[PDB]
């Protein structure tokens, strides 16, 4: 028997196409889920400060943000974890000395160096950013994005040690997405479930990236798309259609959730 | 033997015009050398705390008037208002056309009337300020940026209005709020979260550090420090402090640049 109480949705490439935004069918699906007593919670690597306006306009029940460091539900901030400030200063000091592209994030802003800005500029050309790393001083930081060799990464691991884990890793581009140990999307989903009195069996998620693989152990059903990260597709319960082929709506309709 | 020195910023540790005296900096180093932790306890957010305070190398920071607690870099507490309630309040105050500001831990969001209140407070820097010194910041330029508020986590609402407009804010927030401070003559209300005032914050840290009220000494100045005094054994004010704080204070120490903090600590054999 299945009666879902929690829909977990990733934003980028799941709920929302990076170029064409959110399809009406997904907005409708969300509205229908909520009518059927199934909470809809955004579960994103984005911070509340970088979540897009169209996502904020949906009236979802909660937000798991920063890749799992921040949990808000029905407006109430439940969890908001940030790295030890002294450890961030050491990392920032190291990474400036190493002259590698990097960024750090608070729940409001992304602080990035020149090399990192140049990476995001080029990412956008393959569809403004500022060298503002010197604006970091006392903000609460929950994520470090690093483009470097294995040696520079090991130096960051020597500073953070057991306090960190990788949310995501792209070997080819030398990219590491560093978050706090046990504050990935999966752990946040569990914390939220525990606050709401919802079980794993009552939870269904939709993801697309490597940062969504962790959603699986927190969910009964995990849905990916054809274009999703292969490791996610390999463990997904099913593959729904692409964003603008009404994948979320159709998947929810097939499972009789809406 | 005291284990926790709680220091206020504005009007106690730091003079609004002249900054922090060397005796205070030296007294902090001396307390730490004697295994007494030094923790800043301010209405300021980590984002509005002045660089000279950040350069001191204090053991921790109780910020936002008590919603935020950090110790040895470790963020221990960081409470923010319900986002939906803040939307209602922001919506209500825009239509009532009163000066107001809301604060996140990084930033202050203020309407036009509030920008003008703050510009004037900076122009009046050096005069007997009381509350103005708690808001003055040379770091930023003030501006009508309330429309930039959307999803930021908010812990404080500053309101300049009649009690009708305040009663309307109280109807929305109910027992989720309390007044950290209030200046009746200027119609000022400093609205914080219920049970996240300076004393409750001091008590959370005491609990975590395993330090007692008896092992805690505080230095305060404003109406917002009355509660600070209630979570401490020895409470120190100054001659120009808020009278209600002076009424409950253990002692009155000398003015900032008369080395009050150092002299009081030396007199008590803490340093
Ligand atoms: Na994604």
Short mmCIF file of C-alpha atoms and ligand atoms in Angstrom, two decimals:
data_model
loop_
_atom_site.label_atom_id
_atom_site.label_comp_id
_atom_site.label_asym_id
_atom_site.label_seq_id
_atom_site.Cartn_x
_atom_site.Cartn_y
_atom_site.Cartn_z
CA UNK A 1 0.00 0.00 0.00
CA UNK A 2 1.17 3.53 -0.85
CA UNK A 3 -0.04 6.96 0.30
CA UNK A 4 2.67 9.59 -0.26
CA UNK A 5 3.05 12.43 2.22
CA UNK A 6 6.25 14.03 0.87
CA UNK A 7 7.21 14.94 -2.72
CA UNK A 8 10.86 16.01 -2.92
CA UNK A 9 11.82 17.91 -6.03
CA UNK A 10 15.15 19.03 -7.30
CA UNK A 11 15.13 22.34 -9.16
CA UNK A 12 17.65 22.47 -12.02
CA UNK A 13 16.95 19.87 -14.71
CA UNK A 14 14.07 18.31 -12.72
CA UNK A 15 11.40 20.84 -11.83
CA UNK A 16 12.94 23.63 -13.85
CA UNK A 17 14.63 23.66 -17.25
CA UNK A 18 17.66 26.00 -17.05
CA UNK A 19 16.56 27.76 -20.28
CA UNK A 20 12.74 27.36 -20.44
CA UNK A 21 11.83 27.40 -16.73
CA UNK A 22 9.03 25.39 -15.10
CA UNK A 23 6.27 23.77 -17.25
CA UNK A 24 2.63 24.43 -16.25
CA UNK A 25 2.05 20.69 -15.79
CA UNK A 26 4.61 20.62 -12.92
CA UNK A 27 2.98 23.67 -11.25
CA UNK A 28 -0.37 21.87 -11.64
CA UNK A 29 1.09 18.58 -10.31
CA UNK A 30 2.40 20.43 -7.22
CA UNK A 31 -1.03 22.08 -6.66
CA UNK A 32 -2.68 18.62 -7.03
CA UNK A 33 -0.18 16.94 -4.62
CA UNK A 34 -0.86 19.55 -1.95
CA UNK A 35 -4.63 19.05 -2.42
CA UNK A 36 -4.00 15.29 -1.79
CA UNK A 37 -2.15 15.98 1.53
CA UNK A 38 1.29 15.32 0.00
CA UNK A 39 3.78 18.07 1.00
CA UNK A 40 5.97 19.41 -1.81
CA UNK A 41 9.49 20.36 -0.77
CA UNK A 42 12.23 21.80 -2.94
CA UNK A 43 15.57 19.99 -2.46
CA UNK A 44 18.39 21.99 -4.09
CA UNK A 45 22.14 22.71 -4.05
CA UNK A 46 21.07 26.37 -4.51
CA UNK A 47 20.84 28.58 -1.47
CA UNK A 48 17.64 30.50 -0.64
CA UNK A 49 19.49 33.49 -2.15
CA UNK A 50 20.01 31.77 -5.55
CA UNK A 51 16.65 29.89 -5.84
CA UNK A 52 14.87 31.35 -8.86
CA UNK A 53 11.75 33.57 -8.51
CA UNK A 54 9.54 31.18 -10.49
CA UNK A 55 10.34 28.40 -7.98
CA UNK A 56 9.59 30.78 -5.05
CA UNK A 57 6.21 31.65 -6.68
CA UNK A 58 4.99 28.00 -6.63
CA UNK A 59 3.88 28.08 -2.98
CA UNK A 60 5.71 24.83 -2.13
CA UNK A 61 5.48 23.59 1.50
CA UNK A 62 9.20 23.81 2.27
CA UNK A 63 12.74 24.21 1.04
CA UNK A 64 15.82 22.02 1.62
CA UNK A 65 18.53 24.42 0.37
CA UNK A 66 22.31 24.71 0.16
CA UNK A 67 22.58 21.06 -0.80
CA UNK A 68 21.12 20.00 2.58
CA UNK A 69 22.45 22.50 5.14
CA UNK A 70 19.22 24.56 5.34
CA UNK A 71 15.66 23.22 5.96
CA UNK A 72 12.62 25.48 6.00
CA UNK A 73 9.02 24.19 6.23
CA UNK A 74 5.81 26.28 6.21
CA UNK A 75 8.08 29.32 6.64
CA UNK A 76 9.72 27.94 9.80
CA UNK A 77 13.50 27.59 9.68
CA UNK A 78 14.19 24.13 11.17
CA UNK A 79 17.85 23.61 10.33
CA UNK A 80 20.59 26.01 9.24
CA UNK A 81 24.11 24.56 9.56
CA UNK A 82 27.31 26.34 8.59
CA UNK A 83 31.01 25.51 8.62
CA UNK A 84 33.27 26.53 11.46
CA UNK A 85 34.34 30.06 10.49
CA UNK A 86 38.02 29.57 11.42
CA UNK A 87 38.23 26.52 9.10
CA UNK A 88 36.72 28.58 6.23
CA UNK A 89 39.33 31.32 6.68
CA UNK A 90 42.14 28.71 6.48
CA UNK A 91 40.60 27.24 3.31
CA UNK A 92 40.06 30.69 1.75
CA UNK A 93 43.65 31.64 2.66
CA UNK A 94 45.00 28.37 1.09
CA UNK A 95 42.90 28.66 -2.07
CA UNK A 96 43.94 32.30 -2.69
CA UNK A 97 47.62 31.23 -2.31
CA UNK A 98 47.09 28.27 -4.69
CA UNK A 99 45.52 30.53 -7.36
CA UNK A 100 42.78 28.00 -8.16
CA UNK A 101 39.25 28.91 -9.18
CA UNK A 102 36.89 28.73 -6.20
CA UNK A 103 33.73 29.99 -4.57
CA UNK A 104 32.16 29.88 -1.10
CA UNK A 105 28.45 30.30 -0.33
CA UNK A 106 26.34 31.66 2.42
CA UNK A 107 22.55 31.35 2.28
CA UNK A 108 22.42 34.85 0.74
CA UNK A 109 25.49 35.11 -1.51
CA UNK A 110 28.15 33.40 -3.55
CA UNK A 111 31.65 34.80 -3.00
CA UNK A 112 34.04 33.92 -5.89
CA UNK A 113 37.53 34.74 -7.11
CA UNK A 114 38.48 35.93 -10.64
CA UNK A 115 39.19 32.42 -11.98
CA UNK A 116 35.76 31.23 -10.69
CA UNK A 117 33.95 34.22 -12.29
CA UNK A 118 35.64 33.36 -15.62
CA UNK A 119 34.32 29.75 -15.25
CA UNK A 120 30.72 30.94 -14.70
CA UNK A 121 30.98 33.50 -17.55
CA UNK A 122 32.03 30.67 -19.91
CA UNK A 123 29.27 28.37 -18.49
CA UNK A 124 26.73 31.10 -19.36
CA UNK A 125 28.11 31.53 -22.91
CA UNK A 126 27.45 27.73 -23.18
CA UNK A 127 23.80 28.29 -22.05
CA UNK A 128 26.57 39.47 -13.62
CA UNK A 129 29.32 37.52 -11.80
CA UNK A 130 32.01 39.38 -9.86
CA UNK A 131 35.39 38.78 -8.22
CA UNK A 132 33.95 39.48 -4.78
CA UNK A 133 35.88 36.93 -2.60
CA UNK A 134 37.37 39.87 -0.63
CA UNK A 135 33.78 40.65 0.53
CA UNK A 136 33.89 37.41 2.57
CA UNK A 137 34.75 37.96 6.21
CA UNK A 138 32.06 36.92 8.72
CA UNK A 139 29.25 35.38 6.62
CA UNK A 140 28.08 31.87 7.55
CA UNK A 141 29.39 29.46 4.88
CA UNK A 142 27.95 26.03 4.00
CA UNK A 143 29.55 25.22 0.62
CA UNK A 144 32.94 25.47 -1.14
CA UNK A 145 33.16 24.97 -4.94
CA UNK A 146 36.74 24.14 -5.99
CA UNK A 147 38.37 23.61 -9.43
CA UNK A 148 41.87 22.19 -8.71
CA UNK A 149 44.22 19.19 -8.86
CA UNK A 150 44.17 16.35 -6.28
CA UNK A 151 47.02 17.94 -4.25
CA UNK A 152 45.18 21.25 -3.60
CA UNK A 153 42.04 19.25 -2.73
CA UNK A 154 44.05 17.14 -0.24
CA UNK A 155 45.21 20.39 1.39
CA UNK A 156 41.58 21.48 1.80
CA UNK A 157 40.86 17.95 3.22
CA UNK A 158 43.75 18.42 5.71
CA UNK A 159 41.99 21.61 7.01
CA UNK A 160 38.36 20.38 7.02
CA UNK A 161 38.97 16.62 7.56
CA UNK A 162 35.85 14.87 8.97
CA UNK A 163 33.82 18.11 8.95
CA UNK A 164 33.46 17.92 5.10
CA UNK A 165 32.20 15.64 2.38
CA UNK A 166 31.75 15.99 -1.37
CA UNK A 167 28.22 16.75 -2.50
CA UNK A 168 29.30 16.30 -6.12
CA UNK A 169 32.50 15.65 -8.12
CA UNK A 170 33.28 16.07 -11.84
CA UNK A 171 36.71 14.48 -12.38
CA UNK A 172 37.04 15.66 -16.02
CA UNK A 173 36.78 19.38 -15.10
CA UNK A 174 38.61 18.90 -11.73
CA UNK A 175 35.49 20.14 -9.89
CA UNK A 176 34.75 19.43 -6.23
CA UNK A 177 31.55 20.61 -4.47
CA UNK A 178 32.42 20.60 -0.78
CA UNK A 179 29.67 20.60 1.86
CA UNK A 180 29.56 19.65 5.57
CA UNK A 181 29.66 16.00 6.58
CA UNK A 182 26.11 14.65 6.89
CA UNK A 183 24.40 17.79 5.47
CA UNK A 184 23.77 16.39 1.93
CA UNK A 185 20.25 16.28 0.38
CA UNK A 186 19.59 12.78 1.75
CA UNK A 187 20.36 13.69 5.36
CA UNK A 188 18.23 16.85 5.10
CA UNK A 189 15.34 14.76 3.73
CA UNK A 190 15.68 12.47 6.82
CA UNK A 191 15.79 15.42 9.28
CA UNK A 192 12.64 16.87 7.62
CA UNK A 193 10.86 13.49 7.65
CA UNK A 194 11.65 13.22 11.39
CA UNK A 195 10.24 16.73 12.05
CA UNK A 196 7.09 16.08 9.97
CA UNK A 197 6.45 12.50 11.24
CA UNK A 198 6.67 11.24 7.64
CA UNK A 199 8.44 7.93 6.76
CA UNK A 200 10.76 6.94 3.89
CA UNK A 201 7.93 4.80 2.46
CA UNK A 202 5.72 7.90 2.40
CA UNK A 203 8.37 9.89 0.42
CA UNK A 204 8.90 10.11 -3.37
CA UNK A 205 11.67 12.18 -5.00
CA UNK A 206 12.65 13.48 -8.45
CA UNK A 207 16.29 14.29 -9.18
CA UNK A 208 18.72 14.69 -12.07
CA UNK A 209 22.35 15.29 -10.85
CA UNK A 210 25.05 13.45 -8.89
CA UNK A 211 23.98 15.46 -5.82
CA UNK A 212 20.59 13.66 -5.99
CA UNK A 213 21.93 10.10 -5.69
CA UNK A 214 21.66 10.55 -1.86
CA UNK A 215 17.89 11.16 -2.22
CA UNK A 216 17.50 7.36 -2.89
CA UNK A 217 18.19 6.14 0.67
CA UNK A 218 15.85 8.83 2.02
CA UNK A 219 12.98 7.82 -0.41
CA UNK A 220 10.59 5.01 -1.27
CA UNK A 221 10.59 5.95 -4.98
CA UNK A 222 13.29 7.93 -6.83
CA UNK A 223 12.59 9.19 -10.30
CA UNK A 224 15.14 10.41 -12.84
CA UNK A 225 14.95 11.71 -16.44
CA UNK A 226 16.64 10.41 -19.61
CA UNK A 227 19.19 13.25 -19.49
CA UNK A 228 20.02 12.65 -15.78
CA UNK A 229 23.35 11.68 -14.34
CA UNK A 230 24.00 8.03 -15.19
CA UNK A 231 24.70 6.98 -11.57
CA UNK A 232 21.25 8.39 -10.63
CA UNK A 233 19.50 6.66 -13.57
CA UNK A 234 21.13 3.34 -12.61
CA UNK A 235 19.56 3.40 -9.08
CA UNK A 236 16.30 5.23 -9.96
CA UNK A 237 13.00 3.39 -9.59
CA UNK A 238 11.95 4.81 -12.95
CA UNK A 239 12.78 7.29 -15.68
CA UNK A 240 10.01 9.81 -16.40
CA UNK A 241 9.86 12.00 -19.52
CA UNK A 242 11.84 15.23 -19.94
CA UNK A 243 10.75 18.45 -18.16
CA UNK A 244 8.63 19.90 -21.06
CA UNK A 245 7.33 16.45 -21.99
CA UNK A 246 5.48 16.78 -18.60
CA UNK A 247 7.62 14.15 -16.87
CA UNK A 248 6.75 15.04 -13.26
CA UNK A 249 3.01 15.35 -13.95
CA UNK A 250 2.85 12.10 -15.97
CA UNK A 251 4.95 10.17 -13.42
CA UNK A 252 2.75 11.34 -10.53
CA UNK A 253 -0.40 10.51 -12.58
CA UNK A 254 0.94 6.97 -13.40
CA UNK A 255 1.66 6.32 -9.69
CA UNK A 256 -1.84 7.66 -8.77
CA UNK A 257 -0.37 10.36 -6.49
CA UNK A 258 -2.43 12.93 -8.47
CA UNK B 1 37.53 32.72 39.26
CA UNK B 2 35.48 34.08 36.31
CA UNK B 3 35.23 31.91 33.17
CA UNK B 4 33.13 34.18 30.91
CA UNK B 5 33.48 37.90 30.24
CA UNK B 6 30.45 39.10 28.31
CA UNK B 7 31.10 42.40 26.53
CA UNK B 8 28.63 44.66 24.81
CA UNK B 9 29.98 46.63 21.76
CA UNK B 10 28.45 50.08 21.40
CA UNK B 11 28.97 52.43 24.39
CA UNK B 12 30.83 49.80 26.55
CA UNK B 13 33.73 48.23 24.62
CA UNK B 14 33.73 50.66 21.69
CA UNK B 15 33.24 54.46 21.58
CA UNK B 16 31.14 55.58 18.58
CA UNK B 17 33.77 58.16 17.51
CA UNK B 18 37.09 56.89 18.98
CA UNK B 19 36.71 53.07 18.77
CA UNK B 20 38.21 50.58 21.23
CA UNK B 21 40.84 51.75 23.76
CA UNK B 22 44.10 49.79 24.02
CA UNK B 23 43.39 49.02 27.72
CA UNK B 24 40.21 47.16 26.70
CA UNK B 25 42.10 45.19 23.99
CA UNK B 26 44.84 44.42 26.54
CA UNK B 27 42.24 43.50 29.21
CA UNK B 28 40.65 41.00 26.75
CA UNK B 29 44.07 39.39 26.03
CA UNK B 30 44.70 39.29 29.79
CA UNK B 31 41.30 37.61 30.53
CA UNK B 32 41.97 34.97 27.85
CA UNK B 33 45.50 34.43 29.23
CA UNK B 34 43.69 33.72 32.61
CA UNK B 35 41.37 31.13 30.91
CA UNK B 36 38.36 33.48 31.03
CA UNK B 37 36.50 33.45 27.70
CA UNK B 38 35.63 36.81 26.13
CA UNK B 39 32.35 36.81 24.19
CA UNK B 40 30.84 39.84 22.45
CA UNK B 41 27.08 40.26 23.23
CA UNK B 42 25.55 42.75 20.81
CA UNK B 43 22.34 43.74 19.05
CA UNK B 44 24.51 43.98 15.90
CA UNK B 45 24.52 41.16 13.39
CA UNK B 46 27.84 39.51 12.40
CA UNK B 47 27.39 41.60 9.22
CA UNK B 48 27.20 44.97 11.08
CA UNK B 49 29.85 44.20 13.74
CA UNK B 50 32.75 46.58 13.17
CA UNK B 51 36.16 45.36 11.93
CA UNK B 52 37.96 46.63 15.08
CA UNK B 53 35.67 44.32 17.14
CA UNK B 54 36.45 41.43 14.70
CA UNK B 55 40.23 42.08 14.98
CA UNK B 56 40.14 41.61 18.82
CA UNK B 57 40.30 37.81 18.68
CA UNK B 58 37.39 37.29 21.09
CA UNK B 59 36.41 33.69 21.98
CA UNK B 60 32.90 34.08 20.53
CA UNK B 61 30.00 36.27 19.43
CA UNK B 62 26.38 36.45 20.66
CA UNK B 63 24.91 38.55 17.82
CA UNK B 64 21.51 39.71 16.55
CA UNK B 65 20.59 40.76 20.07
CA UNK B 66 20.71 37.06 21.08
CA UNK B 67 19.48 35.01 18.07
CA UNK B 68 23.02 34.05 16.93
CA UNK B 69 25.73 32.35 19.03
CA UNK B 70 29.18 31.45 17.70
CA UNK B 71 32.09 30.18 19.84
CA UNK B 72 35.67 29.38 18.73
CA UNK B 73 34.28 29.76 15.16
CA UNK B 74 31.60 27.12 15.70
CA UNK B 75 28.07 28.38 14.94
CA UNK B 76 26.03 26.99 17.87
CA UNK B 77 22.72 28.87 17.49
CA UNK B 78 21.13 30.81 14.59
CA UNK B 79 17.38 31.38 15.08
CA UNK B 80 15.27 33.33 12.55
CA UNK B 81 11.61 34.39 12.39
CA UNK B 82 9.00 32.43 10.44
CA UNK B 83 9.37 33.71 6.87
CA UNK B 84 5.59 33.90 6.29
CA UNK B 85 5.14 36.14 9.39
CA UNK B 86 7.94 38.44 8.21
CA UNK B 87 6.15 38.77 4.81
CA UNK B 88 2.91 39.82 6.60
CA UNK B 89 4.81 42.30 8.76
CA UNK B 90 6.75 43.76 5.76
CA UNK B 91 3.48 43.98 3.78
CA UNK B 92 1.69 45.75 6.72
CA UNK B 93 4.52 48.26 7.37
CA UNK B 94 4.84 49.26 3.67
CA UNK B 95 1.11 50.18 3.62
CA UNK B 96 1.24 52.00 7.01
CA UNK B 97 4.08 54.19 5.54
CA UNK B 98 6.22 54.15 8.67
CA UNK B 99 10.03 53.88 8.90
CA UNK B 100 11.21 50.32 9.42
CA UNK B 101 14.07 47.93 8.84
CA UNK B 102 14.51 44.18 8.98
CA UNK B 103 17.80 42.42 9.55
CA UNK B 104 19.37 39.23 8.39
CA UNK B 105 22.72 38.16 9.80
CA UNK B 106 24.43 39.67 6.73
CA UNK B 107 22.31 42.66 5.82
CA UNK B 108 19.85 45.39 6.90
CA UNK B 109 16.78 45.93 4.65
CA UNK B 110 15.21 49.39 5.15
CA UNK B 111 12.58 51.57 3.47
CA UNK B 112 13.16 55.26 2.49
CA UNK B 113 11.93 56.68 5.84
CA UNK B 114 14.38 54.35 7.66
CA UNK B 115 17.33 55.27 5.31
CA UNK B 116 16.67 58.92 6.33
CA UNK B 117 16.54 57.97 10.08
CA UNK B 118 19.97 56.25 9.73
CA UNK B 119 21.60 59.03 7.66
CA UNK B 120 20.58 61.48 10.46
CA UNK B 121 21.95 59.13 13.19
CA UNK B 122 25.37 59.14 11.42
CA UNK B 123 25.21 62.98 11.13
CA UNK B 124 24.55 62.99 14.93
CA UNK B 125 27.60 60.69 15.61
CA UNK B 126 29.36 61.90 18.78
CA UNK B 127 26.20 63.27 20.50
CA UNK B 128 24.48 61.43 23.41
CA UNK B 129 23.03 58.71 21.13
CA UNK B 130 21.71 55.87 23.40
CA UNK B 131 20.22 53.83 20.46
CA UNK B 132 21.83 55.68 17.45
CA UNK B 133 25.29 54.25 18.33
CA UNK B 134 23.84 50.69 18.09
CA UNK B 135 22.94 51.31 14.36
CA UNK B 136 25.77 53.60 13.00
CA UNK B 137 28.06 51.95 10.38
CA UNK B 138 30.82 53.64 8.33
CA UNK B 139 31.21 50.37 6.28
CA UNK B 140 28.09 50.80 4.05
CA UNK B 141 26.01 53.60 2.43
CA UNK B 142 22.34 53.53 3.52
CA UNK B 143 19.67 53.07 0.83
CA UNK B 144 15.99 52.16 0.27
CA UNK B 145 16.69 48.44 -0.28
CA UNK B 146 13.55 46.88 1.38
CA UNK B 147 12.46 45.56 -2.06
CA UNK B 148 15.61 43.37 -2.06
CA UNK B 149 14.03 41.42 0.82
CA UNK B 150 12.43 38.14 -0.32
CA UNK B 151 13.94 34.95 1.14
CA UNK B 152 16.53 36.14 3.69
CA UNK B 153 16.33 34.81 7.23
CA UNK B 154 15.27 37.66 9.53
CA UNK B 155 15.81 37.92 13.31
CA UNK B 156 15.06 41.62 14.04
CA UNK B 157 12.50 44.28 13.04
CA UNK B 158 13.13 47.95 13.84
CA UNK B 159 9.94 50.04 13.82
CA UNK B 160 9.38 53.79 14.19
CA UNK B 161 5.59 54.21 14.55
CA UNK B 162 2.54 55.03 16.73
CA UNK B 163 1.27 52.22 19.03
CA UNK B 164 -1.61 51.47 16.57
CA UNK B 165 0.91 50.35 13.91
CA UNK B 166 2.88 48.44 16.64
CA UNK B 167 -0.31 46.69 17.87
CA UNK B 168 -0.90 45.58 14.24
CA UNK B 169 2.66 44.08 14.11
CA UNK B 170 1.99 42.46 17.52
CA UNK B 171 -1.27 40.94 16.13
CA UNK B 172 0.78 39.23 13.36
CA UNK B 173 3.78 38.08 15.46
CA UNK B 174 1.88 37.38 18.75
CA UNK B 175 4.08 35.39 21.26
CA UNK B 176 6.76 34.79 18.57
CA UNK B 177 8.14 38.30 19.38
CA UNK B 178 9.36 40.48 22.20
CA UNK B 179 10.86 43.92 22.50
CA UNK B 180 14.61 43.88 22.87
CA UNK B 181 14.48 47.61 23.48
CA UNK B 182 12.10 50.56 23.11
CA UNK B 183 12.67 54.35 22.93
CA UNK B 184 9.22 55.84 23.64
CA UNK B 185 10.20 59.48 22.83
CA UNK B 186 11.30 58.55 19.25
CA UNK B 187 8.49 55.90 18.84
CA UNK B 188 11.15 53.22 18.35
CA UNK B 189 10.50 49.52 18.81
CA UNK B 190 13.29 46.95 18.40
CA UNK B 191 11.44 43.68 17.76
CA UNK B 192 13.27 40.35 18.26
CA UNK B 193 12.14 36.74 18.67
CA UNK B 194 10.59 35.64 22.00
CA UNK B 195 13.32 34.13 24.25
CA UNK B 196 16.22 35.20 21.97
CA UNK B 197 17.27 38.32 23.95
CA UNK B 198 20.88 38.79 25.20
CA UNK B 199 20.37 36.99 28.57
CA UNK B 200 18.72 33.89 27.07
CA UNK B 201 21.61 33.80 24.54
CA UNK B 202 24.16 34.16 27.41
CA UNK B 203 22.37 31.23 29.20
CA UNK B 204 22.59 29.00 26.08
CA UNK B 205 26.36 29.62 25.83
CA UNK B 206 26.90 29.13 29.60
CA UNK B 207 25.10 25.74 29.20
CA UNK B 208 27.35 24.75 26.26
CA UNK B 209 30.61 25.94 27.88
CA UNK B 210 29.71 24.41 31.28
CA UNK B 211 30.14 27.87 32.85
CA UNK B 212 27.88 29.06 35.68
CA UNK B 213 26.12 32.38 36.25
CA UNK B 214 28.48 32.97 39.24
CA UNK B 215 31.51 32.47 36.88
CA UNK B 216 30.14 35.15 34.47
CA UNK B 217 30.87 38.90 34.49
CA UNK B 218 29.18 41.31 32.04
CA UNK B 219 29.75 44.87 30.86
CA UNK B 220 26.69 46.65 29.41
CA UNK B 221 25.21 50.06 28.62
CA UNK B 222 21.78 49.92 26.92
CA UNK B 223 18.21 48.97 27.72
CA UNK B 224 18.98 45.79 25.68
CA UNK B 225 21.58 44.80 28.33
CA UNK B 226 19.15 44.72 31.26
CA UNK B 227 18.53 41.04 30.40
CA UNK B 228 22.34 40.46 29.99
CA UNK B 229 22.70 41.51 33.63
CA UNK B 230 20.03 38.96 34.71
CA UNK B 231 22.15 36.03 33.30
CA UNK B 232 25.31 37.20 35.15
CA UNK B 233 26.78 37.45 38.68
CA UNK B 234 28.58 40.80 38.28
CA UNK B 235 26.97 43.37 35.99
CA UNK B 236 28.94 46.54 35.14
CA UNK B 237 27.52 49.78 33.65
CA UNK B 238 28.94 53.31 33.08
CA UNK B 239 27.91 56.85 34.12
CA UNK B 240 26.06 57.55 30.82
CA UNK B 241 24.38 54.08 30.66
CA UNK B 242 20.62 53.57 30.44
CA UNK B 243 19.33 54.47 33.92
CA UNK B 244 17.27 51.24 34.24
CA UNK B 245 20.52 49.27 33.61
CA UNK B 246 22.39 51.49 36.12
CA UNK B 247 19.56 50.79 38.66
CA UNK B 248 20.33 47.02 38.61
CA UNK B 249 24.13 47.22 37.95
CA UNK B 250 26.62 45.81 40.51
CA UNK B 251 28.94 48.77 39.81
CA UNK B 252 29.51 51.76 37.56
CA UNK B 253 32.96 51.65 35.93
CA UNK B 254 34.75 54.56 34.29
CA UNK B 255 34.08 55.81 30.78
CA UNK B 256 35.43 53.90 27.75
CA UNK B 257 38.58 56.04 27.28
CA UNK B 258 38.98 56.40 31.06
CA UNK B 259 39.85 52.60 30.86
CA UNK B 260 36.63 51.47 32.65
CA UNK B 261 36.75 47.84 31.50
CA UNK B 262 40.46 47.38 32.30
CA UNK B 263 40.21 49.25 35.63
CA UNK B 264 37.06 47.36 36.74
CA UNK B 265 38.62 43.99 35.78
CA UNK B 266 41.91 44.96 37.54
CA UNK B 267 39.93 46.08 40.67
CA UNK B 268 38.08 42.72 40.73
CA UNK B 269 41.38 40.77 40.29
CA UNK B 270 40.09 39.15 37.05
CA UNK B 271 43.19 40.56 35.28
NA1 LIG C 1 19.83 19.17 -10.74
#
